Enzyme design. Structure first.
Site, PDB file in Angstrom:
ATOM      1  N   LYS A 115       0.802  -1.207   0.000  1.00 28.48           N
ATOM      2  CA  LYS A 115       0.000   0.000   0.000  1.00 28.48           C
ATOM      3  C   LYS A 115       0.853   1.285   0.000  1.00 28.48           C
ATOM      4  O   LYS A 115       0.461   2.255  -0.652  1.00 28.48           O
ATOM      5  CB  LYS A 115      -1.060  -0.008   1.107  1.00 28.48           C
ATOM      6  N   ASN A 138       0.293   7.521   6.292  1.00 30.66           N
ATOM      7  CA  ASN A 138       1.101   6.634   7.124  1.00 30.66           C
ATOM      8  C   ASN A 138       1.802   7.359   8.302  1.00 30.66           C
ATOM      9  O   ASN A 138       1.693   8.599   8.483  1.00 30.66           O
ATOM     10  CB  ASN A 138       2.123   5.915   6.241  1.00 30.66           C
ATOM     11  N   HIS A 183      -1.916  -8.354  11.948  1.00 30.71           N
ATOM     12  CA  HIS A 183      -2.600  -7.639  13.035  1.00 30.71           C
ATOM     13  C   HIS A 183      -3.565  -8.517  13.827  1.00 30.71           C
ATOM     14  O   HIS A 183      -4.555  -8.014  14.345  1.00 30.71           O
ATOM     15  CB  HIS A 183      -3.351  -6.418  12.485  1.00 30.71           C
TER      16      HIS A 183
HETATM   17  O1  T26 Z   1       6.951  -0.363  12.394  1.00 28.41           O
HETATM   18  C1  T26 Z   1       6.636  -1.559  12.582  1.00 28.41           C
HETATM   19  O2  T26 Z   1       7.513  -2.445  12.779  1.00 28.41           O
HETATM   20  C2  T26 Z   1       5.171  -1.975  12.636  1.00 28.41           C
HETATM   21  C3  T26 Z   1       4.420  -1.727  11.312  1.00 28.41           C
HETATM   22  C4  T26 Z   1       2.888  -1.828  11.494  1.00 28.41           C
HETATM   23  N1  T26 Z   1       2.493  -0.754  12.418  1.00 28.41           N
HETATM   24  C5  T26 Z   1       1.437  -0.846  13.236  1.00 28.41           C
HETATM   25  O3  T26 Z   1       0.895  -1.924  13.432  1.00 28.41           O
HETATM   26  C6  T26 Z   1       0.871   0.371  13.852  1.00 28.41           C
HETATM   27  C7  T26 Z   1      -0.560   0.438  14.222  1.00 28.41           C
HETATM   28  C8  T26 Z   1      -1.107   1.645  14.668  1.00 28.41           C
HETATM   29  C9  T26 Z   1      -0.264   2.726  14.911  1.00 28.41           C
HETATM   30  C10 T26 Z   1       1.084   2.649  14.548  1.00 28.41           C
HETATM   31  N2  T26 Z   1       1.945   3.825  14.642  1.00 28.41           N
HETATM   32  C11 T26 Z   1       1.649   4.973  15.566  1.00 28.41           C
HETATM   33  C12 T26 Z   1       1.403   4.598  16.968  1.00 28.41           C
HETATM   34  C13 T26 Z   1       2.285   3.751  17.623  1.00 28.41           C
HETATM   35  C14 T26 Z   1       2.033   3.372  18.930  1.00 28.41           C
HETATM   36  C15 T26 Z   1       0.914   3.863  19.623  1.00 28.41           C
HETATM   37  C16 T26 Z   1       0.705   3.409  21.017  1.00 28.41           C
HETATM   38  C17 T26 Z   1      -0.208   3.831  21.911  1.00 28.41           C
HETATM   39  S1  T26 Z   1      -1.508   4.983  21.696  1.00 28.41           S
HETATM   40  C18 T26 Z   1      -1.890   4.764  23.378  1.00 28.41           C
HETATM   41  S2  T26 Z   1      -3.262   5.664  24.043  1.00 28.41           S
HETATM   42  N3  T26 Z   1      -1.168   3.868  24.109  1.00 28.41           N
HETATM   43  C19 T26 Z   1      -0.206   3.350  23.301  1.00 28.41           C
HETATM   44  O4  T26 Z   1       0.640   2.481  23.719  1.00 28.41           O
HETATM   45  C20 T26 Z   1       0.039   4.712  18.956  1.00 28.41           C
HETATM   46  C21 T26 Z   1       0.288   5.088  17.631  1.00 28.41           C
HETATM   47  C22 T26 Z   1       1.629   1.459  14.081  1.00 28.41           C
HETATM   48  C23 T26 Z   1       2.208  -1.636  10.159  1.00 28.41           C
HETATM   49  O5  T26 Z   1       2.223  -0.494   9.586  1.00 28.41           O
HETATM   50  O6  T26 Z   1       1.670  -2.651   9.655  1.00 28.41           O
END
Ligand code: T26
Length: 435
Positions: A115, A138, A183
């Site tokens: 994507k 992103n 996920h």
């Molecule tokens: O980088 C990687 O290795 C993972 C890649 C893979 N990332 C995620 O699964 C993913 C899902 C959702 C958000 C984010 N990135 C921003 C973010 C990161 C941690 C948090 C944690 C929070 S929010 C909260 S309240 N308490 C938390 O711990 C919130 C937003 C990443 C993906 O893109 O498929």
């Protein structure tokens, strides 16, 4: 939408949460921020006027809110968020806020793999047409920071998580590129629940673009399609030549692309279908395909030296992405494959068919390193960290070999994100891959 006088709570900071804070302040609404992390990313940049609660969620603030803006990193099924939903308190995300304000058409792209590449390609197609385009959605590029009255087109990469909290998107063209297990730590009703989140992208879209080779990308109940042998947009192989075709007409010999490999060719097809549906001129779209060089961390050659290629594919954060790097892969000598991290409960077994024979070694690390090693224990080593794995494999590397970081897992157990993981690999590869 009018937020004046509303009690607004933002859950989750970081760059995106900050973008939400700034969105409301610019509209004369002072929100409150909460984050379950004690010192979340961005805390130091929050203005002091903004009340915040960290280290936990605050149910007093949530239950008092008129509007909750949830980061995609917090599950909607979190007990505190479900209690608010039950009370009829509106919950949205940043992408929802963006869609309510955008004054240009949106091309919307999701899927388990590809994507970012597709989103970036359609962005380059727009630039090549001289269209003022905003590209993002992103982690590094929050959608609300793109909003600009002069923008003529937006191209958004969207995750299943962002889509769950989005209801006002009416994409000019929308796609799910593929659905493969990912996920699962966030989808306790399994693959179909994860799929359903992605299917939301097609609601009210003017054109839907589906993958003729992946039935899960199709609405459950007139879409344009792309595929390898089948689809409105498809590939034509004759001789040793591959062509992109639209309805039987040749449009591009893939020797003109810098990208290579079947999945890059289907990415190009999906991007062309999206660009076509968005009204971009075909000829400029094809030009962009010839100039695009790929994204960092996506099967990126970081060093080719002394007969050894070191490849950063840190953006392979699920099994389907690693399978794409391994499928059809040519290695003259031995493949030294780095696997590991937080596998999010994925079934790693589909990787096993690629790992037979005398020319494969596995170096497994991070949270799920033991499970990864178990794919084929006789060729596997396990370490705590990626750096340990790298220092263990480097002495064994011989001219003809390939070293591949394509970890099949998220990096979040040991790194800030997959970009930091990639950058560390590149640094070590340069250290270890010359005299
Ligand atoms: O980088 C990687 O290795 C993972 C890649 C893979 N990332 C995620 O699964 C993913 C899902 C959702 C958000 C984010 N990135 C921003 C973010 C990161 C941690 C948090 C944690 C929070 S929010 C909260 S309240 N308490 C938390 O711990 C919130 C937003 C990443 C993906 O893109 O498929």
């Amino acid at each position: 939408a009018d937020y004046q006088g509303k009690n607004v709570v933002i859950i989750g900071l970081g760059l995106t949460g900050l973008s939400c804070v700034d969105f409301f302040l610019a509209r004369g609404v002072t929100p409150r921020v909460m984050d379950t992390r004690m010192t979340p990313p961005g805390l130091d940049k929050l203005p002091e006027a903004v009340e915040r609660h960290t280290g936990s969620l605050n149910d007093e603030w949530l239950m008092a809110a008129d509007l909750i803006v949830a980061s995609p990193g917090i599950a909607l099924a979190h007990p505190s968020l479900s209690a608010a939903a039950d009370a009829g308190i509106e919950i949205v995300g940043d992408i929802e806020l963006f869609c309510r304000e955008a004054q240009a058409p949106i091309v919307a792209i999701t899927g388990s793999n590809g994507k970012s590449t597709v989103t970036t390609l359609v962005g380059e197609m727009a630039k090549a047409a001289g269209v003022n385009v905003g590209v993002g959605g992103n982690i590094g590029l929050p959608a609300l920071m793109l909003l600009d009255d002069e923008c003529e087109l937006y191209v958004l990469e969207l995750s299943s998580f962002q889509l769950e909290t989005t209801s006002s998107l009416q994409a000019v063209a929308a796609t799910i590129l593929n659905v493969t297990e990912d996920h699962m730590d966030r989808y306790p009703f399994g693959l179909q629940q994860y799929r359903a989140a992605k299917l939301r992208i097609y609601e009210n879209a003017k054109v839907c673009v589906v993958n003729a080779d992946d039935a899960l990308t199709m609405p459950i109940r007139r879409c344009v399609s792309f595929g390898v042998n089948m689809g409105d947009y498809h590939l034509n192989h004759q001789q040793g030549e591959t062509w992109l075709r639209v309805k039987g007409e040749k449009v591009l010999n893939v020797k003109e692309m810098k990208l290579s490999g079947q999945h890059n060719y289907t990415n190009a097809l999906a991007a062309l279908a999206l660009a076509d549906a968005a009204g971009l001129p075909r000829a400029s779209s094809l030009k962009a395909l010839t100039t695009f060089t790929g994204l960092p961390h996506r099967f990126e050659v970081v060093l080719e030296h002394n007969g050894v290629r070191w490849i950063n594919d840190s953006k392979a954060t699920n099994v389907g992405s690693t399978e794409a790097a391994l499928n059809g892969l040519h290695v003259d000598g031995t493949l030294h494959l780095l696997l590991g991290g937080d596998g999010k409960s994925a079934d790693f077994s589909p990787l096993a068919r690629y790992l037979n024979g005398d020319n494969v070694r596995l170096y497994c690390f991070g949270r799920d390193g033991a499970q990864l090693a178990a794919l084929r224990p006789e060729v596997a080593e396990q370490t705590e960290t990626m750096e340990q794995a790298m220092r263990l494999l480097a002495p064994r590397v011989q001219p003809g070999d390939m070293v591949l970081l394509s970890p099949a897992c998220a990096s979040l157990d040991q790194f800030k994100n997959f970009e930091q993981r990639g950058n560390e690999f590149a640094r070590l590869a340069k250290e270890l891959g010359s005299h």
